[PDB]
Amino acid sequence: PKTLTVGLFPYLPSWNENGNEVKLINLIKDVLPTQVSGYNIEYTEFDCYSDASLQSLPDVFSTDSIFLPYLVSLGGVKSLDESLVRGVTGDLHSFVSSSASVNGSVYGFPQYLCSNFLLSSPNATQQASSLLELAQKVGYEQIVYPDVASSSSFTVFGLYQQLLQSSSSAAVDIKASDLPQSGDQVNKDITQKYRTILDSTVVASQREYINSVKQGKPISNYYVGYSESMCEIKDIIRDQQYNVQLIGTSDKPYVYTDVLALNSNLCDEKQKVAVEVIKNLLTNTLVLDLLGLGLTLPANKNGIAHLAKSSNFYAQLSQQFDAKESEVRVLRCVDFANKEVKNCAGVLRPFL
Numbered sequence: 001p002k003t004l005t006v007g008l009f010p011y012l013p014s015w016n017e018n019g020n021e022v023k024l025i026n027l028i029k030d031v032l033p034t035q036v037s038g039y040n041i042e043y044t045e046f047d048c049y050s051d052a053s054l055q056s057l058p059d060v061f062s063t064d065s066i067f068l069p070y071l072v073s074l075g076g077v078k079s080l081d082e083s084l085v086r087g088v089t090g091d092l093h094s095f096v097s098s099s100a101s102v103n104g105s106v107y108g109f110p111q112y113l114c115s116n117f118l119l120s121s122p123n124a125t126q127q128a129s130s131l132l133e134l135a136q137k138v139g140y141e142q143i144v145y146p147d148v149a150s151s152s153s154f155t156v157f158g159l160y161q162q163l164l165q166s167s168s169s170a171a172v173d174i175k176a177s178d179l180p181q182s183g184d185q186v187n188k189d190i191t192q193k194y195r196t197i198l199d200s201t202v203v204a205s206q207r208e209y210i211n212s213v214k215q216g217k218p219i220s221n222y223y224v225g226y227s228e229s230m231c232e233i234k235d236i237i238r239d240q241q242y243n244v245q246l247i248g249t250s251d252k253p254y255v256y257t258d259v260l261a262l263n264s265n266l267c268d269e270k271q272k273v274a275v276e277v278i279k280n281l282l283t284n285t286l287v288l289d290l291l292g293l294g295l296t297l298p299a300n301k302n303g304i305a306h307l308a309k310s311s312n313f314y315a316q317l318s319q320q321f322d323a324k325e326s327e328v329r330v331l332r333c334v335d336f337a338n339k340e341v342k343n344c345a346g347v348l349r350p351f352l
Helices: 024-029 051-055 065-072 082-089 094-100 131-138 146-150 153-164 188-198 206-214 227-239 270-283 285-293 301-308 312-323 338-351
Strands: 003-008 014-016 021-023 039-045 060-064 109-115 117-120 171-174 243-245 255-262 330-333
Touching: 003 024, 003 270, 021 024, 024 285, 039 270, 051 065, 051 338, 060 065, 060 270, 065 094, 065 255, 065 330, 082 109, 082 270, 094 109, 094 255, 094 330, 109 227, 109 270, 117 227, 131 188, 146 153, 146 188, 153 188, 153 330, 153 338, 188 338, 206 227, 227 243, 227 312, 243 312, 255 270, 255 330, 270 285, 270 301, 285 301, 301 312
Parallel strands: 003 039, 003 060, 171 330
Antiparallel strands: 014 021, 060 255, 109 255, 117 243
């Protein structure tokens, strides 16, 4: 009767050799307790990248902060005290806490930190501060950037808005009235920047890149993607001394944050049980250690520090997040979600 539904972020890395696929989300799920404070805890996968799932929120769910303000305007998420979050997550970065806050108030506990980092081989040859700067230097077809090469809807939409909008704060909140609707609304200056980067990317998938690095013959010394996509070579990264940094597609660096939030229709007792489940998800050393195996980044400084004590990879990102703590931006949506993102991407693609 008294049960708690938990919607976990399902997009964690996975492993493979041949046929047998191992999902990190399954390893973590088998560690989480199914009985807390007399409550029966149900852990299921919550796809925040599905508009249908955003319509029916569970008791407690993990969602990308890119849809947080839109999720707030529907009322389905409960506002939380500043002290309640700080007593669980500990110290957060300026951009991490900003990505979780909507209109002053806080609406969730930051769980994961994500971004399109630059994995540069020791054979660096050339360095840069932004992707545009890097693209010009490396020339035609040098960098590996699978999402851009494949023109993923979420990436096409993202890079366009990153090149376009600019903000003094950390939260770049855009609305549906800022998205190209036809084609004459497509900013040609921004489409120019994207093409510069696309021309510097080799038509090669992430799988092809990982295989090449494993076989000792990298197809490129440059790679852009999520840190979770580098988990299958985390040994080679540590051994052969690969470098990883925060690079903006232009000027300002952008990151993604996954946030644990609770439904607003919760009682007052369930409200306490949820915090315990969340406090476990964010502070349990076994969960953190498992996240380290997939190169997944915790959102709190405590979580990052814990994994930095035995990983050079996590060490660089800790220094990175601290040095550029004020320059990091987070793209969020005010009055739209997945449907508009896919539609906007569909408009932009022919102009790329």
